[model samples]
Target: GSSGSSGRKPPPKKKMTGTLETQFTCPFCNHEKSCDVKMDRARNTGVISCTVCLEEFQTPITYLSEPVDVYSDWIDACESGPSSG
Candidate 1:
């Protein structure tokens, strides 16, 4: 008899696919790299690596959490407009 529905309903789940621009700084040599991170609606996890130092890391997909703020000079250069002759 305890199978009755609860008075309150659980929050609806979210399902979608998206990419996140992730930037990481090397803890060894201060090198930085920008990577395109992919998120799955189900798994909601991805692997990240540092191109310079070749260090690997993991990221998770969650709405209630916030990612760290990472800065990279390489990204700045790439976004910068073409140089003048």
Candidate 2:
């Protein structure tokens, strides 16, 4: 038997993907990707705010979820509007 590429345990320090960022492009009035993301476990919510428009919105997130995933999910939901047929 060999020990390579075990799928049982994930690395504690690293996340799912290498791409990590807390700031992204806001849907409205976002110039130069002036958006900030916040994730909270205790509060159990995710928030993305745009400095350009001074807009704030909330979304649900899990403990493992981060800024980028949360923001991306939000964007998809907002834009496509549940049309996966």
Candidate 3:
């Protein structure tokens, strides 16, 4: 008997290579910092280190497909929206 699975080839893995700024909160001081990271989709992970506080973190490669919005506003506080002064 012939099996199609043996003759079939697997799909090629997607490689993600790009530089992006990611935000991270300091565990010791709770300070937020955006650090630069080089992502690799093939590996599914990237290593990032904080420049300010010298912190190391592993960044996920999924960030490539995600949309990031950059805005300044205090959404948690009421009367601070567009209607507020």
Runs in model 2 lying further than 4 Å from the true structure: 1-19, 80-85
Q: Write the per-residue lDDT of candidate 2 for residues 1-85, one digit (tens) a residue.
A: 8777756876587556444567787766758568888887888788778888797767777788888886677677667654232
| Candidate with maximal lDDT | 2
- Stretches of candidate 3 exceeding 4 Å from the true structure: 1-21, 59-85
Per-residue error for 7 in candidate 1, Å, reads 65
User: lDDT by residue for model 3 over 40-83, one digit each (tens)?
Assistant: 56876565555566654453446454212111111212124332
Off by over 4 Å in 1: 1-21, 33-40, 67-85
User: Candidate 1 lDDT, tens digit per residue, 1-85?
Assistant: 5687659779889987432346555554565444433333366544445566555444444544333321232334236632231
- Is candidate 1 or 3 superior in TM-score? 1
Structural similarity to truth (TM-score) of each candidate:
0.36, 0.62, 0.33
Residue pairs in steric clash, candidate 3?
none
Order of quality (TM-score)? 2, 1, 3
